[PDB]
C-alpha cells in the first residue's frame, strides 16, 4: 500500500547536459529506527537486466560513475545525472522497500543529438521464400536522428500500403541514432506481376526523399 | 563472481500453471532474501514478493496482485529458488526476474539474474523461417528474415557473436498469432564476400537452431 510515482515519464537530453528525475512516494520511507531511506534506483539499458545505481536514497553503488547522485528525504527524491553520457539511454526505475517492495513506474530517458540521415538499403525476397510462395521485401533505415521517418513502398511506381510492417530500434548506447526495418509482404503470384520494387524514406534531414530499389528481370 | 540464472519460461495457455527456477552462485545463498520480479513487454517493472533469509526462518510475502496464486520457495541445499505460477492469465505474460534482496543489514537489489520469458496464449508453437537477406560501395550492409514464429523470443548472433558493432535486430512484430524480426549488420565491403557472414538464429520455444550463411546472389 505505497504507492510509488516517478516524472517525467520520459525526456531527452543532449550529451553533456545535467538532468533531474523525480520520485514521489505514498508514505515516508524515512526508517525512523535506522535514520535512513529505503529507496533506490535501478537502471535498465534496452534489452537489459536492471542494473543498482543508488540505495538508501543516496549512497552510490561501487562502479557506479560519480555522474549519477541519489538526493531526497521523506516522500520526495530525485537522481541526478550531471553531464549525460550517450551510454546513460535507459529506463530510471525508483523503489521502496520500507513495507515489502514497490517500484515506480519508470523515467525514459533519451538522448538528444545532431539531425542524421538514415542509410537505406533494399532487399529482395529470397529464393527459398519465393519456393514457398511467398514474397517479402525488406527496407532498412540505418543510423538516422531524429525518430520520426515516414516510408512509402513503390511497386511499378505506384504507392502500395497493404501488407507493410513496420518496427523502429530502440535508440543506440554509442551514437544516439535510431534504426527502423520496412517489410512489404506479398505473394509469390502478386510478386511475379509487377517489375520495379522502391522503398522511399522521407526524413527531416532532406527535402529529397532517399530512394533504394531493384528490378526483379535485373534478378533482384 | 555473484551469478543468477532464471529459468522454465516459454508458453503456457490461459488458465495453466508454470514453475520457474532461479539458480545462484558465488555467494552465501542463506544469508539473503530473495525476490522475483516481472515485466511485460515495454512496461514497468513490478515486485511480486519474497522469501526471507536464515536468521528470518525463510518465511515469504507477496504483492497483492499475485498472493494467494503464485508461490515462492527455496532449496538451500542447492542455492535455488522457485516461482510456482497458478491459473495463468494474458497478465501474467512477462519477462520474470529473480533478484538478491536484503541480508539483514543492505537496503538493495544488488544482482539480478538474465530474466525467463513467460507468455500466456493459446496460440501454437510454430518455428521461424529464417531467410538470407543479400544485397542487389564502402560499407556493405546484410540481414537476416526471422519470420513467422511464436511464443517469443528469439536470438540473432552475427558469426557466432564475433560480429557484434554495426548490427541493429529489430522488435519483433506480431501480426496474426505470429512474430517477425530482422537483423542487420553492416561490414567493410573488402571482407564480404571475401570472408563469410553468416546469422545464427535460435529459437527456444521449439528447440530450433539455424544458420543462415549470407552468399552473393
Ligand atoms: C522493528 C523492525 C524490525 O525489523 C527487522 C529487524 O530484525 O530489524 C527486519 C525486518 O525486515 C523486513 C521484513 O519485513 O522482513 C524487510 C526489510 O527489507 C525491511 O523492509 C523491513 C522494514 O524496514 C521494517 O523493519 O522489513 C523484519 O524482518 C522485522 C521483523 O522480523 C518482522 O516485522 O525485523
Ligand atoms: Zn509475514
Ligand atoms: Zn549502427
Redo the contacts with the bound molecule.
Sequence with gaps: DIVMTQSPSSLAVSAGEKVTMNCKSSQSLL?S?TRKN?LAWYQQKPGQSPKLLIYWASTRESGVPDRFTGSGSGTDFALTISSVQAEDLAVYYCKQ????RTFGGGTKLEIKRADAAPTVSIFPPSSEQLTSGGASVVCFLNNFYPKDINVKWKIDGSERANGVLNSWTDQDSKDSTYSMTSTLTLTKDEYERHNSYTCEASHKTSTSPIVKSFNRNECX | EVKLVESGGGLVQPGGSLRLACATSGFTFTDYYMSWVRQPPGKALEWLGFI?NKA?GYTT?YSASVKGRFTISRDNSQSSLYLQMNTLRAEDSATYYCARD?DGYY?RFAYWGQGTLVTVSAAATTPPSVYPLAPGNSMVTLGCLVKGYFPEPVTVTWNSGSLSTGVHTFPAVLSSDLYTLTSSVTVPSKTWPSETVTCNVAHPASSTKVDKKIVPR
Design positions: 526508517n529506527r529505503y522497500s520500507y513495507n515489502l | 526471507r528470518k510475502e536484503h537496503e
